[PDB]
Amino acid sequence: DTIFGKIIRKEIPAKIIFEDDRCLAFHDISPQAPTHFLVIPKKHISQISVAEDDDESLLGHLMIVGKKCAADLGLNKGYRMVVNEGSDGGQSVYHVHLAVLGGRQMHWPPG
Amino acid sequence: RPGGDTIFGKIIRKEIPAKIIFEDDRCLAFHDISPQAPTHFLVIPKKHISQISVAEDDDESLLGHLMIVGKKCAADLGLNKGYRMVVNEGSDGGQSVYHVHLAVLGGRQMHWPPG
Ligand SMILES: Nc1ncnc2c1ncn2[C@@H]1O[C@H](COP(=O)(O)OP(=O)(O)OP(=O)(O)OP(=O)(O)OC[C@H]2O[C@@H](n3cnc4c(N)ncnc43)[C@H](O)[C@@H]2O)[C@@H](O)[C@H]1O
């Protein structure tokens, strides 16, 4: 279990943007841009490297939900979606998460 | 034309060369021409979608397929210490090629914030 499991279970608070039967979107507690939120599956997939073929449409659902949340939050000028894997990827929580950052110019390289 | 007529559509149809990692009926993975990490590749749909903000609901499986292929290619390329997947959207996201692309970067420590 991780802190994101606690958030899904409503045991600790987060600023929830969207929820359905299979995912949750909420603002990141350590924002790196004026808008910075996460979309996470309710299924506990620890990291993208272990996602199974059967998870394909769920992973795409995270991206469609992230797209819709970004539009609802006014990110008309663009944004960046990020999935971190493992140590080199800087993955901070072992529950897969799609980060969405916008409201400023994002730079290159992306870390 | 299948794939559209950006540079990425030209790569899909073999009109412009690329260093291809994986190809199926839905997507293509190839190495980036301007790598920002020791390994840096792209996964693109063969269906032309200009940018993620106009993807349709019925594109869900295709987008998830880009991520599955990205993680499978990262494993085949030996990125066992990890990697970062990046989808740039529009001006603030840093997008110039208006054909959806998922970038995978690894082979070094990635930093925070991600740009
Ligand atoms: N054949 C290939 N094979 C493998 N990988 C490839 C590839 N081609 C691209 N890639 C890679 O695909 C990934 C995603 O590509 P992108 O990040 O979308 O675009 P890019 O190819 O990196 O364009 P770049 O930043 O260099 O061009 P710019 O807009 O400054 O400027 C481009 C032109 O647009 C003009 N322009 C840009 N912004 C403008 C503006 N606001 N107004 C007027 N003109 C503008 C500029 O003057 C300039 O002439 C990248 O990592 C890239 O390396």
Q: From CA A66, how far away is CA A98, in angstroms rounded? A: 8
Question: Measured between alpha carbons, how far is B96 from A43 in angstroms, rounded to an integer?
Answer: 34
* CA A38 vs CA A44, A106, A109, B75, B101: distances in Å: 15, 17, 21, 25, 20
Q: Which of these, B81, B73, B93, lies nearest to B32 by C-alpha position?
A: B73
Q: Which two tokens stand for residue B63?
A: 């987008």
CATH fold of B1-115: HIT family, subunit A (3.30.428)
Kindly list the residues from chain A whose CB atom is less than 8 angstroms away from the CB atom of residue B67.
48, 51, 56, 59-60, 63, 83
What resolution, expressed in A, was reported for this entry?
1.4
The two tokens of residue A5 are 């499991």
Return the closest-CA partner of residue B100 out of A41, A64, A58, A85: A64
CATH class of A1-111: alpha beta
B60: left (phi over 0), alpha (psi -120 to 50) or beta: alpha
Q: How was it solved?
A: X-ray
Using CB atoms, pick whichever of B68, B92, B110 lies closest to residue A111. Answer: B110
Domain-wise residue ranges, chain B: 1-115
Closest-CA distance of chain A to residue B1, Å: 25
Q: Which pair of tokens denotes residue A7?
A: 């958030």
DSSP A52-99: -GGGHHHHHHHHHHHHHHHHHTT-TT-EEEEEEEHHHHT--SSS--EE
φ, ψ of residue A70 to 5 degrees: the values are -60, -40
